């Protein structure tokens, strides 16, 4: 009954949740700005931010481990080279959420999530 339990369900099973976060995590780092619902964004930080922390140290083992997530070499290629140095001097809080109202199709809590600086 959710006593000291973490991990939202999002009306999906374990396989769909893992794949959807994996696809969304790669999309976010590729563009540095995506728009998704508030519960999706809030659980996305528990995925991309640990991934960035792993990407802080560059090694053959870390890159392979980072490749096991997001299942994409180009996403791993951008990591350890671009987002590494930018977040090397930062301890957590790589992402922030910007609420932007509700959709007109289903009236869902809408929010942007992006990196800290985005170099823009």
């Amino acid at each position: 009954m959710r006593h000291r339990k973490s991990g939202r369900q999002l009306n999906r099973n374990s396989s769909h949740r893992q794949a959807m976060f994996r696809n969304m995590a790669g999309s976010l780092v590729r563009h540095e700005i995506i728009k998704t619902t508030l519960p999706k964004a809030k659980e996305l930080r528990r995925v991309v931010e640990p991934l960035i922390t792993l990407a802080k140290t560059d090694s053959v083992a870390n890159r392979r481990l980072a490749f096991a997530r997001t299942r994409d070499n180009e996403i791993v290629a951008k990591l350890f080279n671009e987002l590494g140095p930018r977040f090397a001097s930062r301890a957590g809080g790589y992402t922030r959420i910007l609420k932007c109202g509700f959709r007109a199709g289903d009236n869902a809590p809408m929010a942007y999530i992006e990196l800290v600086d985005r170099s823009e």
Partner: protein, 56 residues
């Protein structure tokens, strides 16, 4: 399970007494453009805490 007598409009009206919407009052006022927006939300043109957040 179904009615035995027709409920009147008085019962119907009293049941809808708790269905009234709660209108917002004091959403926010921007510190840069001074335009109405939700609390802890960006404006129409991506303003939050004064500085740009969307860059269009």
């Amino acid at each position: 399970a179904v009615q035995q007598n027709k409920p009147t409009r008085s019962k119907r009206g009293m049941r809808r007494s708790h269905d009234a919407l709660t209108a917002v009052t004091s959403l926010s006022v921007d510190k840069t453009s001074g335009e109405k927006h939700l609390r802890h939300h960006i404006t129409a043109d991506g303003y939050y805490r004064g500085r740009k957040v969307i860059a269009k």
